[model samples]
Target: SMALTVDVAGPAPWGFRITGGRDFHTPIMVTKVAERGKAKDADLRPGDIIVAINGESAEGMLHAEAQSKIRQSPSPLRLQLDRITSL
Candidate 1:
């Protein structure tokens, strides 16, 4: 339910990586966290499921489109996310 922001530039890199299936119900998961990327410093974790960007729900995208959102944002990347848990 909590949100966080990670300011980044361009599409080549942002210090983090994502992975998820095309299944709409399967969220785009933060699959990797760089040792010293903006995301790492911003407290993002590897299992976080991105729910939105810049206060906009990401129901429209899963991965590529979501990444594009971050890459093209003129403002600092704002992410609304939920951590994935195994029960």
Candidate 2:
């Protein structure tokens, strides 16, 4: 499990979108990164698995639950991402 931190701030959108994959069990990845988003500014990319949000574990959480956590705050949203690498 790899980790990265990004502080997403400002505006109506943070410049990113997420998908839970084929199923909830699948890793929650950054499916989209907006060209003008705070996430993009931080160099965040699609396929980065979100391991936690605001320090909360997303391992066993459902897609909707994790989405809620991310959307729970607008600006100053801190993220803990786990970038999975294939062996």
Candidate 3:
């Protein structure tokens, strides 16, 4: 597993989607990263597990809560992620 930090500036839509929250009994994961969006420029990718948002831990966060956090955070959002590789 490797940790990655992505800083993305936003005005509302950060251009990414996520899934697998505590409510779903799964780790919060990035489901999609728009090709022409800031997330892509920030190097975020599908399958990345969100570890924290703006330095706050994401563990046990519900789907809606996580989404709200992302939407409400200020510009230059700091997302800490975990990337696990098998091999």
Candidate 4:
């Protein structure tokens, strides 16, 4: 496993979606990356768990809370993530 920081500088609809969190009793994870969007260009991928957002820890955050952070953060969205790997 490894950590990754993806910087996506652009406007709203960063071309990505997220899943998992307190509501799901799981770590916040990247659920989708648009094919022709900032996220894809930034190399954000599905299954990567969000570790932090703009330097704020994401641990234990509810889904809505995490989504709110992403939606309200500034440009060049700083996303710290844990890349999943096969054993």
Candidate 5:
């Protein structure tokens, strides 16, 4: 593996899941964790099903499309996630 160094002012990566949700079309369950971010104090958690990534509907989206949409976003993106305790 290779490592690279960079510089960023202010906050590093932080945030967590809200809950879990299923894609009606793809019919698959996808969940993720968010580091401790401002949202954390607001009550966000891990394994949260992302309801929306940067405003686009995450539900039923092809995994690639959904992922690309998110990974390509600028840092500190305001993500809207749904809290789910169960898959």
Candidate 6:
């Protein structure tokens, strides 16, 4: 699998970064899957918590700590996550 870097400020969902939870562990889910560069039809808003990753788990890792691992995987990553904290 091709690992992608998480640029919270420039490559993240909302130009923001978190310290805990899947916000900094999971990948950027194309929840909306909109067409073109237009607005997202269905955005993964805040409070949506990440439940898992490609059937794996994302519970005890910090943002800066789990970044590389998350990107170095060899499978279609799935993050069973949900938004939980404030920006």
Residue-wise C-alpha lDDT for candidate 1, range 1-87, written one tens digit per residue: 445554444343567887763555567778888997777777789888777777777766757787777777654677778864565
Give the range of the ten consecutive residues with the poorest summed lDDT in model 5. 1-10
Compared with the true structure, what per-residue lDDT tens digits does model 5 show for residues 7-53? 11224343332222243353212344444454444444444455566
What RMSD does each model have against the real structure? Answer: 3.2, 2.5, 1.1, 1.1, 10.8, 10.0
Please give, for residues 1-87, the per-residue lDDT of candidate 6 as tens digits: 223222211122322122354455454333332242211222333334444544555576555544454455343333455544444
Judge candidate 2 at residue 25 and give its lDDT.
65
Question: Pairs clashing in candidate 2?
Answer: none
How many pairs in model 3 have backbone atoms within 3 A of each other, for residues 3 or more apart or on separate chains, i.e. clashes? 0
Model 1 lDDT-worst window of ten = 3-12
Report lDDT (CA) for all predictions. Answer: 0.70, 0.78, 0.90, 0.90, 0.44, 0.38
- Please tell me which model should have the higher TM-score, number 2 or number 5: 2
Off by over 4 Å in 4: none
Off by over 4 Å in 6: 1-18, 21-42, 73-76, 83-87
How much RMSD separates candidate 3 from the native structure? 1.1
Candidates sorted by lDDT, best first: 4, 3, 2, 1, 5, 6
Q: For every model shown, what is its TM-score relative to the native structure?
A: 0.72, 0.81, 0.93, 0.94, 0.47, 0.36
Please list all clashing residue pairs in model 3, or write none if there are none.
Answer: none
Q: Give the winner by lDDT: 2 or 4.
A: 4
**Model 3 alpha-carbon drift over 4 Å, by segment:** none
Model 4, 1-87: lDDT tens digits are 899898998786888899888888989999889999988999999998999999999987899999999988899899999998985
Displacement of residue 33 (Cα, Å) in model 3 is 0.8
